[PDB]
Ligand SMILES: [Ca+2]
């Protein structure tokens with residue numbers, strides 16, 4: 001029984017897919033407290049949008065750059081959780097260690113069923129390297145605790 005999650009964080013350059021501005025580095029969003037909407041998935045698999053509720057500058061620390069099978073990367077703390085194809089939110093290091101698949105997403109269109117729209121891909125983490133100390137951040141959302149990155153990966157949001 002998990003007491004709580006680690007206070008994971010994303011590196012400055014990690015781009016979040018915003019509705020109003022498209023891909024934007026989380027560092028910019030937080031540093032400038034940019035009000036915009038992100039895409040998230042609910043417990044029943046519906047993809048929908050929600051406005052950011054909290055902007056947290058987490059300071060700095062050692063971060064790793066994980067490389068995905070399609071060449072994209074995730075720059076974050078090793079314990080940052082992401083959605084897998086089994087629909088579990090697990091640390092990126094676990095996904096790497098166990099070679100699990102990240103569940104990624106490659107008129108009115110929203111909200112829509114995750115499995116019946118958008119190009120769904122099953123992407124493994126093929127490696128990682130250290131980027132040294134970088135500025136880190138996270139954002140809090142008013143509803144579900146996850147949001148889509150520009151590379152399609154679904155990241156866990158702040159639980160505070
Ligand atoms: Ca694959």
Ligand SMILES: [Ca+2]
Nearest residue numbers: 072106151152
């Ligand atoms: Ca892509």
Ligand SMILES: [Zn+2]
Nearest residue numbers: 056138158160
């Ligand atoms: Zn936070």
